């Protein structure tokens, strides 16, 4: 039925997409040829979701590779799986971003954009039933940034009843990886806060605080992040590719999830994590999965939601549950915390329940939560953009590439007015 | 017959050129 058109953009979204890809291939029982050799038919049962099939018993996922600098892509071609992508979506240019959202937005991205529309189109006529595209990125490289925003614009006139969902790595409140992350921060949410219609919030200092406190991992490595991201991202969509008791696709996830339609940003959660000595100490129910999920330690965005309400919760489980139980949960949560959820919305909590577990697991839980508390994100961002602006710092790297000061002042202005909006339904 | 050749140096008013303060309003 329902289809999926993978973008993958920027070195953190090539990484990422490499380790989500990875897990795909594992859940679907295929191996790095591409020939399936699982053991189960549900496996096949849903494998056009993700995957075109060329004659021959081999599998192809239906991925796009963007980046502007050639060397990512290349050492996605030499690891595992390099093969399993057909060499025809690996759509790179020469000249690279240097963290210039100007830049990958309006030259670079402008000149690689129609290359990379020509193959999107491509993919999507071979789609039976096109649902979503799906948009693995970072804000702060200039490639993934500014080719995400002009990507975004531009599928969004194409396709204008599709669903734009993208998994976005937001900044982190402490220790910055980039000098001028808030400019291409501010001017990819200018974009992103129009065209998209849900993006995930994920911080890397979440990754690692909860890779630290929960999994006690000593030498964590943007491959271990990146599986935490991966398993999410594969337990936002479990739904559409495996049977269950109460199942859950994009549109509906989508309608639950943003009340107003420029409230759309969220922040993703998993349960469970233990570390490997642990594991032999901790029975695993349906309540465990629900004390992890409703904690502030285990939100993978730098943001304690306790700071403000929720407007809407997503909760979907994975592996054989009693119904009863996981709705006698959602109820003691609601009820326990009503304080923290809007007077204005009641029963604030749609779930769903998918039958088949993560592998080596017994049972597991995604979280989705739409919380009022990511103003403080935001406003954050838009402290350090408006010292930072004062001064004209590092403004004319943006400025010489075609940017005046009327875009700044109106990203300025609209991600205030974002602001102020989370303000007023709190 | 002769004067050392001294002469009277001076960088008397020298402005900046970094526009730091122009969006300081
Ligand atoms: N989650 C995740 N984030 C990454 C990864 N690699 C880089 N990043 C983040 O992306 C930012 C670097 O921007 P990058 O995408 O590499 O620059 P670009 O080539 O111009 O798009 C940093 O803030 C990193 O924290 C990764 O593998 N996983």
New interface residues.
Partial sequence: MREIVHIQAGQCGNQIGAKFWEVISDEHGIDPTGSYHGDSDLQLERINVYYNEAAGNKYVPRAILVDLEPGTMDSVRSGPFGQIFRPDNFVFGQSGAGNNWAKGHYTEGAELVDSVLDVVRKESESCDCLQGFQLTHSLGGGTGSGMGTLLISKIREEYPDRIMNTFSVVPSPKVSDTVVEPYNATLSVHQLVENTDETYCIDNEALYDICFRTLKLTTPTYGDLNHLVSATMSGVTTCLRFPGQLNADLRKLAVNMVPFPRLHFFMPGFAPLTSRGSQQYRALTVPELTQQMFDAKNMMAACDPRHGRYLTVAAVFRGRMSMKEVDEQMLNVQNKNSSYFVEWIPNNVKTAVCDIPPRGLKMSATFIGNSTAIQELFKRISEQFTAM????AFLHWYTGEGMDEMEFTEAESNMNDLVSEYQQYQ | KVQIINKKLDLSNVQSKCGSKDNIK
């Avoid at chain 1, 602006?389 to 004209?392: A, E, H, I, T, Y």
């Fill in positions: 602006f004062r001064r004209k």
